Design a protein around this ligand. Structure first.
Ligand SMILES: CCCCCCCCCCCCCC(=O)OC[C@H](COP(=O)(O)OCC[N+](C)(C)C)OC(=O)CCCCCCCCCCCCC
Ligand SMILES: [K+]
Length: 1314
């Protein structure tokens, strides 16, 4: 409309060509994900014009389109592959918008969103021009060209030429816009045999490559790649930029080589992996003939480096330059051909073989355009008589890979780069971080050339000896406070108010018990520093026992009496306690050589009589943890902890806390004490109540609780017990990781949620996160006088975004491990690399220092998250499983198998589950590499005594080592199997064989899908095949569409001989029985088989053989109009063939011969006995299973006891139970098959042809028990022209693999073909 002067008159195709291998990969990706814009190349300009421009843009447009045939190309697909068509003319797609009213920021965004509109590569043109008016005579013009059509080198050729036509540059080399076709067509003649030296090179270079890199992501990887990306432009300082150039000269290497080396070093530091792959596009125009040619010539190569951290940067840089040099020798091999040869596991979440890229592009002979083509704004212009070009930067080609580094440009001394990153994996903050780290590697390279890759520290120099200021907790005097005095004050003040709920104990009464228990212990030998075993039931005496023991100056050792006796004995022996303080009932419980004291015998004593006596000792307790380790905790740590916790909890008089945690778990310390410090109430929860969800829901609703701390296990128990929630309740969750699912459930049930963390060695908790949103979970903020550090294996502070060991410093630290000084000395140290951080504790926990400043937990360095060369985030798998309806919990582990091989196992619990159903679900929701190899149902996940998941105690999995051959079960699976077989050249394909594992690859998938579209009458995508890639899975998808219309002809083999062999269905109406036969027939003979229409449309089965034959003959004459004909059938198929022959004579066609395999002649003697409906079903059930070598025996007598509907359900259910029908077959499906069966029966029952001679081969199953005569009765129909051959097998088994080979041979020897 801004462009009336064109008119659309309708185009014709000039010529048809092949696409190149360099085009195939891009093309494929665009079909695979049609909303993809990642390959939309965009060059854009500010354009200011003078009036003398006139009509030149349209005139020049028309001239260019005419001169360069490439610009008139489309790339449609057929079943023989992918083509390029040159159209005689294309209507240009030129969009023109008013942008006078739009702010600059917004205008950029507009143009970015406009140019990302996707192309359909099958419909021309494959390029667009987007125009925007910005003011009078002032425009922005953006040219968009899909990379499947041409590369950037081509852009420059085109840019320079069109600029000359416009009067902007003085001269331009001639451009060839027709050579791309010759190139592609010649390439189609070439072979590239599996024996090619270049192909072998790549096959070896990438054999040990990991499936995926192990760079920590900010988000979980989506199951199917969406090609969303973003871009971060950076600049290298002029200092370093110069250094790099000089450092390049100080080696053999190129500048490209140097920066690539820097990039590997970077990814090595970020992932701590030695095996890294980086993709690098090459220009691809080695022949001088191709320098001026438009087209897509760029080829990806994958460089897999094995990093040796011991190498110096000099040495390693040289190592890369050399592997680069060798690799460029073999660059002729297309990336798609390399992926075909290496044959990695196809996975829709990642680009195959490489997910990291580096492009280094500098065009030559484009000096005038240098600054215009940079990714930054520049005031430089190109001024012509009629117009003026200026910069206009546009984000473009985003989301090709996980990460792409783009370099090559320079401005005012500084190298200019663009880091492109996938925004479903990385945050903007992480991109910024990667750039800052690259900056660092490059700097450290020029400054210290000889430094070893391990010795190299990329980390920022941290200012006040910490990674983030958040990681240092508030400095306070809390550790110098007096816990006892605080509690005494509350006793003196709170008086007769409640303190403990078992009957209720007042604060005054509590003080009396403290005193009486302290005096009991003193009076019986307990002195300051002694260790006192504590073996109690959860009563109100429990808090009092703790404080009593403390007041006598002793430390307690928790001996929870519900724990197993062997465990308690091991503690007794290591701790060597002075006495065991227990209760009456338990005095004889353990046979131990240690004095016992009954706490009930302790008097009650007025506090005023023994307060002069009472004072805490140095050590508060020895808490045992998994050989037994006793962690000795001092009272300064405890009070530091408690006070720190109070800042967050603000405990008051109205506080009512439900204590549920065993006192043999240190976290119980918080539950049993902190309300007593402030005048509130401790509800000591009986153990039987806290292990029963319904009983705990009732205790909660009753006692008006407002603080509850518990491990996830307990919280899960509560939510799974229909708990109503409390909006005034403050919840604490600790001991194990908090998953997002539990978090959201909790957030809607409680008023405040803390995720809280810390090893026993740094006193209960050490960090704490106020969780407000389930999407944002971390270890949170450090407590008072606590410092968190994330270290590597050399104990240096890691860079942000990197994983390491969490070390903890400050006032929380334990005194030691009880009488284990060497262990104590190794786990509690000061470090030279942190000389001001004091004593620190080594947690053995794996933690990530986020770019955010947050810490996330991945914990326990000792566990192998490492699989086939990469690492897994097990919890992401666990989250997807928990989101299934039915599933209640899930745990995923890595286990070892056979050789040095690792596999994933998923354990699940729930009220109602389907295991195969799980596999299917995760496959569509997870990246392929995160889908478990085994699924095990459990009733109850094994717990520890602390109430944590006991991962060591899950039963070991027994992995399937192979997948069972299963034959296709209905017409849909028969058609897919034959199609898989035929297209892959695999003899026999089972419904669980994977297309790509069987040797299939991306081009084949395009061919396959285009065939399936024709065969079924519907639209399928390569996306559907990628994700449903077994016959079973794809068959379920196709089966869902009730509007599919299969042909009744299935082509089992396309041969090279003129005459096909036609095969006709037996009684059941299906072609299944000819598949195995077809595998052994001479492959040069076309074979076609005909199923009954009855199998696809209701009531469509013919009931008269005469009518059946006419119908089929018409179907035959569409593919083979004239004879001679060649016909055959197994069983009843033979009889159809006979009648078809009889009719072909009548119309003058000749019959070459008939193949009849154990066909009972159509004569009265051979008609089956009369059957009632039950018997017919019983027969049908049997004849359903026999083609698969299975007996299915449903006695007629059993069926007669049921209603007719029950009958059909019973047979359907049974047939499924032995896998001769699909599980998703419904009763109506079953009616089609039974009705077809009945129809053929009636047809048989009414067919009695007069004798007629045809040339016949009758193959008789010689082991068939049932007597039908020497010739199955054919001696009464055929006189002179019948040849008989007796072969092993019975009426069914003659067609099974073992016996059917001899049948094929007989057919081939009787009816030879040249
Ligand atoms: C993919 C390869 C294709 C190569 C084709 C060559 C480029 C041809 C430019 C096509 C743009 C034509 C669209 C167009 O008509 O734009 C309209 C504007 C304003 O026109 P309008 O306001 O309609 O003027 C009417 C004047 N009247 C009534 C008195 C006749 O007029 C303009 O804004 C014209 C701006 C021209 C910018 C030329 C820039 C040259 C470098 C291009 C290099 C790109 C190759 C990669
Ligand atoms: K620019």
């Amino acid at each position: 409309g801004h462009m009336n002067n064109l008119a659309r008159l309708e185009p014709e195709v000039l010529s048809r060509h092949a696409i190149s291998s360099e085009q195939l990969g891009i093309w494929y990706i665009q079909r695979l994900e049609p909303t993809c814009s990642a390959y939309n190349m965009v060059v854009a300009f500010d354009v200011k014009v003078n009036q003398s421009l006139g009509n030149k843009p349209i005139e020049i447009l028309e001239a260019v389109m005419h001169d360069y045939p490439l610009l008139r190309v489309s790339m449609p697909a057929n079943d023989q592959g992918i083509e390029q068509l040159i159209w005689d003319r294309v209507y240009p797609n030129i969009i023109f918008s008013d942008a006078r009213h739009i702010e600059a920021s917004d205008l950029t965004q507009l143009v970015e969103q406009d140019t990302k509109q996707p192309f359909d590569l099958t419909q021309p043109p494959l390029w667009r021009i987007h125009c925007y008016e910005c003011g009078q005579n002032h425009y922005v013009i953006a040219f968009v060209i899909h990379h499947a059509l041409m590369d950037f080198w081509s852009i420059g050729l085109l840019l320079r030429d069109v600029s000359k036509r416009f009067g902007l540059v003085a001269e331009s080399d001639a451009v060839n816009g027709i050579e791309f076709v010759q190139y592609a067509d010649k390439q189609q003649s070439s072979v590239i045999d599996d024996t090619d030296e270049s192909l072998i090179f790549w096959k070896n270079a990438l054999k040990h490559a990991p499936h995926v890199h192990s760079i920590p992501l900010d988000y979980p990887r989506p199951a199917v790649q969406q090609h969303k990306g973003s871009s971060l432009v950076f600049r290298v300082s002029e200092s370093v930029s110069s250094g790099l150039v000089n450092l390049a000269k100080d080696y053999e290497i190129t500048l490209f080589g140097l920066v690539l080396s820097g990039f590997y070093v970077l990814l090595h530091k970020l992932s701590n992996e030695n095996n890294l792959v980086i993709a690098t596009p090459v220009a691809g125009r080695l022949e001088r003939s191709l320098r001026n040619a438009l087209g897509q010539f760029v080829n990806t190569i994958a460089i897999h480096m094995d990093i040796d951290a011991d190498q110096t940067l000099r040495q390693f840089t040289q190592q890369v330059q050399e592997q680069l040099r060798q690799s460029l020798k073999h660059q002729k091999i297309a990336f798609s051909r390399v992926v075909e040869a290496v044959s990695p596991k196809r996975d829709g979440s990642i680009n195959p073989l490489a997910q990291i890229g580096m492009f280094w592009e500098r065009l030559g002979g484009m000096d005038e355009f240098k600054e215009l083509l940079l990714p930054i704004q520049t005031p430089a212009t190109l001024v012509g008589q009629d117009l003026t070009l200026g910069s206009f930067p546009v984000r473009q080609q985003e989301g090709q890979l996980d990460i792409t580094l783009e370099m090559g440009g320079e401005y005012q001394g500084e190298l200019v780069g663009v880091l492109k990153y996938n925004t479903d994996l990385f945050s903007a903050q992480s991109a910024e971080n990667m750039v800052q780290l690259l900056q660092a590697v490059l700097s450290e390279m020029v400054a210290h050339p000889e430094r070893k890759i391990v010795e190299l520290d990329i980390a920022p120099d941290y200012k006040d000896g910490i990674q983030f200021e958040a990681l240092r907790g508030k400095a306070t005097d809390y550790a110098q406070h007096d816990l006892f005095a605080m509690i005494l004050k509350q006793i003196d003040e709170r008086g007769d108010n409640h303190a403990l709920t078992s009957h209720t104990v007042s604060y005054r009464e509590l003080g009396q018990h403290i005193a009486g228990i302290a005096e009991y212990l003193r009076a019986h030998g307990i002195t300051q520093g002694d260790r006192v075993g504590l073996m109690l039931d959860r009563t109100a005496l429990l808090p009092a026992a703790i404080l009593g023991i403390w007041a006598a100056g002793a430390a307690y050792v928790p001996l929870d009496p519900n724990f197993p006796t062997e465990r308690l004995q091991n503690i007794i022996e290591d701790a060597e306690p002075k006495v065991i303080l227990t209760q009456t009932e338990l005095m004889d419980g353990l046979n131990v050589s240690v004095p016992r004291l009954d706490i009930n015998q302790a008097g009650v004593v007025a506090l005023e009589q023994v307060r002069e006596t009472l004072a805490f000792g140095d050590i508060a307790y020895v808490m045992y943890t998994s050989k037994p380790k006793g962690v000795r905790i001092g009272h300064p740590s405890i009070i530091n902890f408690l006070l720190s916790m109070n800042d967050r909890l603000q405990v008051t008089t109205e506080t009512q806390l439900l204590a549920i945690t065993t006192y043999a778990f240190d976290i119980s310390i918080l539950e049993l004490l902190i309300p007593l410090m402030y005048g509130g109430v401790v509800h000591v929860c009986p153990r039987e109540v806290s292990q029963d969800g319904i009983q705990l829901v009732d205790y909660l609703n009753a006692k008006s609780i407002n603080v509850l701390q518990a491990t996830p296990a307990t919280w899960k128990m509560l939510l799974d017990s229909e708990w109503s929630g409390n909006a005034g309740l403050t919840a604490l969750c600790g001991g194990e990781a908090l998953d997002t699912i539990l978090a959201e459930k909790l957030l809607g049930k409680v008023g405040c949620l803390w995720n809280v963390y810390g090893p026993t060695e740094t006193t209960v908790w050490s960090s704490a996160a106020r969780i407000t949103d389930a999407k944002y979970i971390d270890l949170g903020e450090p407590l008072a006088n606590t410092q968190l550090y994330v270290l590597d294996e050399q104990q240096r502070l890691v860079p942000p975004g990197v994983m390491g060991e969490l070390w903890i410093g400050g006032d929380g630290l334990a005194v030691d491990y009880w009488q284990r000084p060497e262990l104590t000395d190794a786990q509690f140290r000061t470090l030279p690399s942190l000389p001001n951080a004091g004593r620190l504790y080594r947690t053995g926990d794996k933690v990530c220092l986020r770019t955010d400043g947050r810490l996330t937990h991945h914990g326990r360095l000792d566990f192998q998250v490492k699989i086939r060369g990469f690492r897994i985030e097990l919890g992401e798998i666990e989250n997807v499983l928990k989101q299934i309806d039915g599933i209640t919990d899930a745990v995923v582990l890595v286990k070892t198998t056979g050789d040095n091989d690792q596999k994933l196992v998923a354990y699940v619990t729930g009220q109602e589950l389907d295991i195969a159903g799980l596999k299917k679900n995760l496959q569509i929701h997870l990246p392929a590499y995160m889908v478990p190899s085994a699924f095990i149902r459990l009733d109850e996940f094994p717990m520890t005594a602390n109430k944590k998941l006991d991962r060591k105690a899950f039963p070991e999995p027994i992995f399937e080592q192979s997948n069972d051959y299963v034959a296709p079960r209905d017409p849909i699976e028969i058609e897919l199997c034959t199609t898989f077989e035929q297209i892959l050249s695999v003899k026999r394909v089972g419904i669980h064989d994977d297309f790509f594992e069987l040797g299939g690859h991306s081009l084949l998938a395009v061919k396959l899908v285009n065939h399936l579209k024709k065969a079924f009458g519907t639209e399928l995508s390569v996306a559907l095949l990628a994700q449903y890639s077994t016959v079973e899975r794809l068959g379920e998808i196709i089966r869902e569409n009730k509007e599919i219309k299969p042909s009744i002809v299935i082509e089992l083999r396309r041969g090279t001989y003129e005459q096909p062999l036609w095969l006709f269905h037996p009684i059941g109406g299906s072609t299944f029985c000819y598949m195995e036969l077809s595998r052994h027939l001479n492959p040069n003979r076309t074979l076609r088989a005909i199923q009954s229409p009855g199998l696809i449309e209701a009531d469509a089965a013919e009931v008269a053989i005469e009518e059946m034959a006419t119908l089929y003959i018409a179907e035959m004459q569409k593919m083979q109009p004239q004879g001679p004909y060649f016909l055959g059938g197994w069983c009843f198929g033979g009889a159809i063939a006979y009648e078809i022959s009889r009719q072909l004579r009548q119309m003058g066609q000749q019959v070459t011969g008939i193949v009849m395999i154990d066909t009972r002649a159509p004569i009265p003697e051979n008609v089956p006995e009369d059957a009632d409906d039950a018997m017919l079903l019983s027969w049908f059930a049997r004849d359903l299973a026999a083609p698969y070598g299975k007996k299915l025996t449903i006695p007629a007598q059993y069926l007669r006891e049921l209603s007719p509907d029950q009958m059909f359900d019973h047979v359907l259910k049974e047939a499924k139970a032995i896998n001769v029908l699909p599980l998703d077959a419904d009763p109506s499906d079953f009616r089609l098959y039974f009705d077809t069966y009945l129809a053929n029966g009636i047809a048989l029952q009414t067919y009695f042809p007069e004798p007629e001679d045809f040339p016949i081969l009758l193959v008789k199953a010689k082991d068939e028990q049932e007597d039908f005569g020497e010739s199955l009765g054919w001696d009464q129909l055929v006189k002179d022209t019948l040849t008989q051959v007796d072969l092993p097998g019975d009426h069914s088994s003659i067609m099974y693999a073992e016996n059917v080979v001899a049948v094929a041979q007989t057919i081939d020897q009787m009816y030879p073909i040249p």
